[PDB]
Write a protein that binds this ligand. Sequence first.
Ligand SMILES: [K+]
Ligand SMILES: [K+]
Ligand SMILES: [Mg+2]
Ligand SMILES: [Mg+2]
Ligand SMILES: [Mg+2]
Ligand SMILES: [Mg+2]
Ligand SMILES: [Mg+2]
Ligand SMILES: [Mg+2]
Ligand SMILES: [Mg+2]
Ligand SMILES: [Mg+2]
Ligand SMILES: [Mg+2]
Ligand SMILES: [Mg+2]
Ligand SMILES: [Mg+2]
Ligand SMILES: [Mg+2]
Ligand SMILES: [Mg+2]
Ligand SMILES: [Mg+2]
Ligand SMILES: [Mg+2]
Ligand SMILES: [Mg+2]
Ligand SMILES: [Mg+2]
Ligand SMILES: [Mg+2]
Ligand SMILES: [Mg+2]
Ligand SMILES: [Mg+2]
Ligand SMILES: [Mg+2]
Ligand SMILES: [Mg+2]
Ligand SMILES: [Mg+2]
Ligand SMILES: [Mg+2]
Ligand SMILES: [Mg+2]
Ligand SMILES: [Mg+2]
Ligand SMILES: [Mg+2]
Ligand SMILES: [Mg+2]
Ligand SMILES: [Mg+2]
Ligand SMILES: [Mg+2]
Lengths: 73, 119, 155
Amino acid sequence: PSRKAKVKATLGEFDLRDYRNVEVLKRFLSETGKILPRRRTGLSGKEQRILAKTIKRARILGLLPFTEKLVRK
Amino acid sequence: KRQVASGRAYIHASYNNTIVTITDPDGNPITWSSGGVIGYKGSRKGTPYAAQLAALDAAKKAMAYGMQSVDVIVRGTGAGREQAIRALQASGLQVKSIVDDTPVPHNGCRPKKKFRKAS
Amino acid sequence: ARRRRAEVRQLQPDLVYGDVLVTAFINKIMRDGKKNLAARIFYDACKIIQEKTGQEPLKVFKQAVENVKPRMEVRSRRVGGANYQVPMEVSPRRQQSLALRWLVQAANQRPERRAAVRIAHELMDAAEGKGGAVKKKEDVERMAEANRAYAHYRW
RNA sequence: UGGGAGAGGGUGGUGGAAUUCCCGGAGUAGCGGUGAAAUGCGCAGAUACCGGGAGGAACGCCGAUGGCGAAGGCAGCCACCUGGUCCACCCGUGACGCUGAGGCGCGAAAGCGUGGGGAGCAAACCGGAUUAGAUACCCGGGUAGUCCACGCCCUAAACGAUGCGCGCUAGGUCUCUGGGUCUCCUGGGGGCCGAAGCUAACGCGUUAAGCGCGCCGCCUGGGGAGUACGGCCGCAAGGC
Ligand SMILES: [K+]
Ligand SMILES: [K+]
Ligand SMILES: [Mg+2]
Ligand SMILES: [Mg+2]
Ligand SMILES: [Mg+2]
Ligand SMILES: [Mg+2]
Ligand SMILES: [Mg+2]
Ligand SMILES: [Mg+2]
Ligand SMILES: [Mg+2]
Ligand SMILES: [Mg+2]
Ligand SMILES: [Mg+2]
Ligand SMILES: [Mg+2]
Ligand SMILES: [Mg+2]
Ligand SMILES: [Mg+2]
Ligand SMILES: [Mg+2]
Ligand SMILES: [Mg+2]
Ligand SMILES: [Mg+2]
Ligand SMILES: [Mg+2]
Ligand SMILES: [Mg+2]
Ligand SMILES: [Mg+2]
Ligand SMILES: [Mg+2]
Ligand SMILES: [Mg+2]
Ligand SMILES: [Mg+2]
Ligand SMILES: [Mg+2]
Ligand SMILES: [Mg+2]
Ligand SMILES: [Mg+2]
Ligand SMILES: [Mg+2]
Ligand SMILES: [Mg+2]
Ligand SMILES: [Mg+2]
Ligand SMILES: [Mg+2]
Ligand SMILES: [Mg+2]
Ligand SMILES: [Mg+2]
């Protein structure tokens, strides 16, 4: 299904190139530090590609995570 | 003997066996078990039942230190992972939380032939 | 039974107890179609469970049975080349079937010369908890479960 | 002239996950491996867990049914150096074009020199199994190699098995990139189905095997044979 609302849908006006806006980027990572796929982030090929570049930058700065622990299994 | 009360329970599932390590609130092992520690000597070690016992054994051994609650850390995929968990939830011990932490490389070392041909 | 699911034929109630479970046991006691001969053995044995016990046969019967019903057994299966004895439950219909059969089999294995005696004597040892009929049963169970390591092969 | 999208190339730097190794802690009998096993490893304390180091190699999710490049081929992130290409304007030259024998350059993997580096993997090899045998498939080890610099080699199912260029001949749908009077039009890519037509069929079908023109390269029954001989080329293996 995948319809708990698209990530972009909830956010407002954000700069996809702002690699310091952790509060927003945070929204695009799954329960794990994994970058969500388009079918979930609801971005466009062009946007999603830009986002990814940003998310990665953040991780280098320590702002975002490379990976997290699942809490079930 | 040292009394710990709360701690960690690391289930390490494999396709060949299932070992379990109960440690203190910060990783130091208290007791442990596995399909080997218990009877099974071979392929039997991998079976889910084996997993169950190993879980119980370690669980019991642990309570003989006061252990009343545990945080669970699962690692790996194996014909006997879920059973080890279910076994601990019933081992009297209180299962505070379950959490998978199976290691996965961010793509690095070339696996043995036994695991390639992938992609 | 490749097509439908086979309907368990219904037997004629007992002419002395109006019981179907009796006729069933009587049929198992039966040899080459001679039922009269069979029937006798049973009742004649019921009369022996009468003398040697204040309890009525019908009751001794039921209990004797009830004790020999296995509730678990191991059926085979092929996996990877090797064979495994998978422990699985035992349906009601089969429990009964194995019981009555086992009794008669254990009975005729007894040392006493007279048939009706063996059936009576086995039946008694049965309700008592002893007897080879029960031994066969407890054994099937020991066998089963004693392979719990393979139970994850739900039939 | 203004604007754009890219794993296109080269150099330096840098991040985190994982494997191995070493140190320490804590722990104790097994771990591993398979169809089942054994070789193997472990009381000189392994496996499992935590903390700290060292090192090499490759970049998870994003990642596509996607993009770029003339092919090979190209993905972590940052900077510098650098090629190609698309669109808008319709502003300059004024046929300055197309193809291209030979030549020159490029050219996956393996392989070859000299010097480095070697964590994981792994031809040969050393062993354990399986088997009638098992110079194998399965299991435990393991050298060259795989990585880097510089120089060679130049092959391939180097494939769309489809040489470039241009013009012409319904449309439908999805997608990546521009521009616009941003339902929808326009341009350049990537796919699918299909007009006409073509095809031995299979299929192809504005990304042609369609309709045409230009230029190159090839084919002419199978085996012998990509062999022999002769030439070039290569350190060699060998290549043409
Ligand atoms: K060498
Ligand atoms: K046709
Ligand atoms: Mg008769
Ligand atoms: Mg690039
Ligand atoms: Mg030894
Ligand atoms: Mg010792
Ligand atoms: Mg460490
Ligand atoms: Mg080293
Ligand atoms: Mg392209
Ligand atoms: Mg290719
Ligand atoms: Mg003009
Ligand atoms: Mg003029
Ligand atoms: Mg080459
Ligand atoms: Mg190479
Ligand atoms: Mg070399
Ligand atoms: Mg190896
Ligand atoms: Mg053979
Ligand atoms: Mg041999
Ligand atoms: Mg090997
Ligand atoms: Mg191809
Ligand atoms: Mg040509
Ligand atoms: Mg189309
Ligand atoms: Mg198009
Ligand atoms: Mg298009
Ligand atoms: Mg047609
Ligand atoms: Mg078509
Ligand atoms: Mg044409
Ligand atoms: Mg054709
Ligand atoms: Mg030729
Ligand atoms: Mg010929
Ligand atoms: Mg050749
Ligand atoms: Mg050759």
